Enzyme design. Structure first.
Site, mmCIF file in Angstrom:
data_model
loop_
_atom_site.group_PDB
_atom_site.id
_atom_site.type_symbol
_atom_site.label_atom_id
_atom_site.label_comp_id
_atom_site.label_asym_id
_atom_site.label_seq_id
_atom_site.Cartn_x
_atom_site.Cartn_y
_atom_site.Cartn_z
ATOM 1 N N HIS A 118 0.824 -1.206 0.000
ATOM 2 C CA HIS A 118 0.000 0.000 0.000
ATOM 3 C C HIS A 118 0.864 1.264 0.000
ATOM 4 O O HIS A 118 2.009 1.242 0.449
ATOM 5 C CB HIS A 118 -0.938 -0.031 1.201
ATOM 6 C CG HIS A 118 -0.239 0.070 2.524
ATOM 7 N ND1 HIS A 118 0.252 1.260 3.021
ATOM 8 C CD2 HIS A 118 0.046 -0.871 3.459
ATOM 9 C CE1 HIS A 118 0.800 1.050 4.208
ATOM 10 N NE2 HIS A 118 0.684 -0.235 4.498
ATOM 11 N N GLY B 180 2.289 1.098 12.607
ATOM 12 C CA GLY B 180 2.264 -0.279 13.059
ATOM 13 C C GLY B 180 0.855 -0.827 12.942
ATOM 14 O O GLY B 180 0.219 -0.699 11.880
ATOM 15 N N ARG C 11 -5.619 0.489 5.325
ATOM 16 C CA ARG C 11 -4.771 1.030 4.255
ATOM 17 C C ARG C 11 -4.449 -0.069 3.209
ATOM 18 O O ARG C 11 -4.443 0.173 1.976
ATOM 19 C CB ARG C 11 -3.491 1.657 4.835
ATOM 20 C CG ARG C 11 -2.579 0.729 5.683
ATOM 21 C CD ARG C 11 -1.657 1.635 6.498
ATOM 22 N NE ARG C 11 -0.593 0.981 7.255
ATOM 23 C CZ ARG C 11 -0.666 0.682 8.553
ATOM 24 N NH1 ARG C 11 -1.771 0.943 9.238
ATOM 25 N NH2 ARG C 11 0.379 0.134 9.169
ATOM 26 N N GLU D 9 0.934 -4.965 9.272
ATOM 27 C CA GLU D 9 2.232 -4.303 9.419
ATOM 28 C C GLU D 9 2.933 -4.758 10.704
ATOM 29 O O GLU D 9 2.289 -5.278 11.625
ATOM 30 C CB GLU D 9 2.042 -2.769 9.396
ATOM 31 C CG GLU D 9 3.313 -1.912 9.496
ATOM 32 C CD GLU D 9 4.274 -2.170 8.366
ATOM 33 O OE1 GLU D 9 5.094 -3.108 8.502
ATOM 34 O OE2 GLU D 9 4.183 -1.483 7.318
ATOM 35 N N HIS E 156 1.539 -5.086 3.590
ATOM 36 C CA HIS E 156 2.378 -3.997 4.108
ATOM 37 C C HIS E 156 3.861 -4.277 3.875
ATOM 38 O O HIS E 156 4.224 -5.410 3.591
ATOM 39 C CB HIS E 156 2.116 -3.799 5.599
ATOM 40 C CG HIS E 156 0.667 -3.666 5.937
ATOM 41 N ND1 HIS E 156 0.074 -2.448 6.192
ATOM 42 C CD2 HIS E 156 -0.312 -4.596 6.048
ATOM 43 C CE1 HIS E 156 -1.210 -2.633 6.459
ATOM 44 N NE2 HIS E 156 -1.469 -3.930 6.377
#
Ligand SMILES: Cc1ccc(S(=O)(=O)Nc2cc3c(c(O)c2O)C(=O)c2ccccc2C3=O)cc1
Ligand SMILES: [Cl-]
Lengths: 237, 233
Positions: free
Chosen positions: A10, A23, A61, A88, A185
């Site tokens: 992303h 995070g 995201r 993430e 991520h």
């Protein structure tokens, strides 16, 4: 080759603009990061890519990046699977702090050490942390055991909890002939890439995957890449 | 004391909801999308939480769901899509407006079709502009020959929706999972008819509103304990 696998990282989040550690904090894309996802989607569309199943994290995201891509390639009807294991890296107590606040509280030496380490985690996110309940008490992690829900992660930890999902859920789908798209991520995708390519800690820590660009792997039946990863887009991109 | 929420998508592009959109994969218009945002908005204002979502494989329904999850900040929910929740397949009528339908088939036959529970429209033939677009669409490639319709009566539509309801949705509800279903008028008709035990006549007279959360409270037997409630201002 026998199999084809596509990854996408992303783009820019609202907290990236604030230069704060996200995070597991569920920051949305910035308008520019959303446009990045649109350009990636368009590149996949121009190249005629077709998928059979999609994997993503439980963070918006990444999820919004997936949605944007499926929209662009007219494959919104595909099955989609979400998992915390593709989240993430968990930045623990650093979560919510910006660059200045981090160097001010911990010093340049220590932040340099955290940055360059494969296996040293940042400090734990303790119960008095302002995002503690926001993340650790979010119902989306209610089925996690005590040992599964991190208070903080080294890159090693992140990879260690990503790879079981890869082996147990994605790998069989690929061998079943399904064409997989993974929207996730930087660091969870680092886990997948380190596994696919047999990379060292040193090598994986120097690898920074570009954002919003389709990343293409050609794999043999054992899921060994037969050539280097390829980026999808126009010539400048 | 289970809680179940349904939502029917709003307006699709090019006035297709007034042109027997059916299995043609029409997108939402900006207005149908705004209807979805208002629905989401109402669900957020009432503090609704879900554990799993079901929808069709048609993008107007899927985008409705996306819009709702976005508004209530639950994009992380598991989502299950199925052709069995698709709109009714309107066969050769698909894409035609009212005037063209009557011009082509006559008012008598159209009146008979409007009123029948069990009479389908004519099949979508190879000369229909949507024939290959729909019948050769990759999303239906695993459907058997009898499963992929050329046309559907309302009875047909409900007959292929209810097996998904019983086999996939019902066990989730009995587990206590809070379910959201984002689908289409006629597939949601199937579900509502099963829940409330409606007659063919009553279900044909039932027109569910679009873009509005429809809320059911069900007992341990998945029987409604009060009439459906609509959510909004
Ligand atoms: C929120 C934030 C602050 C500072 C930076 S940076 O300009 O110094 N670039 C940067 C910084 C880091 C890192 C990084 O890759 C980087 O490019 C890290 O990997 C890292 C790992 C564990 C603790 C700290 C860091 C880290 O600060 C990036 C992001
Ligand atoms: Cl989805």
């Amino acid at each position: 080759a026998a199999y084809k696998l596509v990854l996408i990282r992303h783009g820019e989040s609202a907290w990236n603009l604030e230069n704060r550690f996200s995070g597991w904090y569920d920051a949305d894309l910035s308008p520019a990061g959303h446009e990045e996802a649109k350009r990636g989607g368009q590149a996949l569309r121009d190249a005629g890519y077709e998928f059979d199943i999609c994997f993503t994290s439980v963070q918006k995201r990444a999820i919004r990046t997936l949605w944007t891509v499926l929209d662009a390639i007219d494959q919104m009807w595909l099955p989609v699977v979400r998992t915390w294991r593709l989240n993430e890296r968990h930045y623990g107590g650093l979560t919510g702090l910006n660059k200045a606040e981090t160097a001010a509280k911990h010093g340049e030496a220590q932040v340099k050490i955290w940055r360059r380490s494969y296996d040293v985690p940042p400090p734990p996110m303790e119960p008095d942390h302002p995002f503690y309940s926001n993340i650790s008490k979010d119902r989306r992690y209610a089925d996690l055991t005590e040992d599964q829900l991190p208070s903080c992660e080294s890159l090693k930890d992140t990879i260690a909890r990503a790879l079981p999902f890869w082996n147990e859920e994605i790998v069989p789908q690929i061998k079943e002939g399904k064409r997989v798209l993974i929207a996730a991520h930087g660091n969870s995708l680092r886990g997948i890439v380190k596994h696919l390519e047999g990379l060292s800690e040193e090598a994986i820590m120097e690898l920074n995957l570009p954002t919003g660009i389709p990343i293409v792997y050609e794999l043999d039946k054992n899921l060994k890449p037969i050539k280097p990863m390829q980026f999808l887009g126009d010539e400048e991109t």
